[PDB]
Amino acid sequence: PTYTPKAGDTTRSWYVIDASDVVLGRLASAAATLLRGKHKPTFTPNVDGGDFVIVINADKIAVSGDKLTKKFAYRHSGYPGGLRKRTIGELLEKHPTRVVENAIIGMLPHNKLGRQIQKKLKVYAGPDHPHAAQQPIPFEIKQVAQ
RNA sequence: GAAAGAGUGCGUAAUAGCUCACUGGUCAAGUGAUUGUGCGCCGAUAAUGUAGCGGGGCUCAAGCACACCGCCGAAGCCGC
Ligand SMILES: [Mg+2]
Ligand SMILES: [Mg+2]
Ligand SMILES: [Mg+2]
Ligand SMILES: [Mg+2]
Ligand SMILES: [Mg+2]
C-alpha cells in the first residue's frame, strides 16, 4: 500500500538561505516550504520530516510598500490594557531576527508537530552562523516554470 | 488711442496709496477650459485585546479589468 516512513527513514539536510534584499513573505514562505518537507517525495503529513534551515542576513530583509512604519506586531500581556505594539521598523533594530522568524511561524501549522518543526529554524541577523560543521548548502529562491 | 474698468482686491472708515483686468517689450513651445469615463483620496467616528483579509504575509501582487492555458475540488457522474 501507500508508503509510510519507518523508524530510520528520515534524513535531514542543512540549507542556508541568504536574506539580503529578499521579500519577507517570499523568503518566509519558501523557508516554511523546505522546513515542513513539502519538497520531498516521501512527504507524509503525520511525520516531521523536513530539513534544517539557516537564514543568514535577517537584517537585510526587504519589506515592500510602506510597512516599515504602519505595520504592527501586537502582543498582549494578559493584564487589562496589556497590549503593546511594535512596528516592523522598531523590531528591525531592537532585535531583528524574530521579524523574519515571526513570518515563518505564521506559515507553519499551529499544532504540536509545528512546535517540533520550529526547532529546525536558525535565524541569524549577521552574515555568518556557527553551524559550519554541518556543511549547509546554499539555497536559492527558485520558481518552476509552466 | 494700445493702455485705462461708471474702475478688479487690500486698505485709506470718504479720498490717497498699494495693485489689478487691459497695449509696448528680451524670453522660447506649447498653454488654458470643459465632457465621458477606469481605478484611487478626504468626510470616517466607542468602550476586555490587534479586532471591517480566517492568519502569516502580499504592491518584486499573493490587488483590479480584459483574453487565454492548466490543474485541485463533493457521498454529483463514470470505472469494478
Ligand atoms: Mg476707479
Ligand atoms: Mg503689472
Ligand atoms: Mg489573505
Ligand atoms: Mg470523490
Ligand atoms: Mg451516486
Blueprint of the fold:
Elements: E1 14-18, H1 24-36, E2 52-56, H2 67-70, E3 72-76, E4 83-87, H3 88-94, H4 97-105, H5 112-118, E5 121-124, E6 137-139
Parallel strand pairs: 1-2, 1-6, 2-5
Antiparallel strand pairs: 3-4
Helix pairs in contact: 1-4
Bound molecules: magnesium ion (MG) (5 copies).
The protein binds one RNA strand of 80 nucleotides through helix 1, strand 3 and helix 4.
What does this structure look like?
The PDB classes it as ribosome. The protein has 146 residues and is of the alpha/beta class. The protein has one domain (1-146). Helix content is 27%, strand content 18%. The chain has five helices and six strands; from the N terminus they run βαβαββαααββ. It has helices spanning 24-36, 67-70, 88-94, 97-105, 112-118; strands spanning 14-18, 52-56, 72-76, 83-87, 121-124, 137-139. Strands 5-2-1-6 form a four-stranded parallel β-sheet, covered by helices on one side. The longest helix has 13 residues, at 24-36. The structure holds magnesium ion (5 copies).
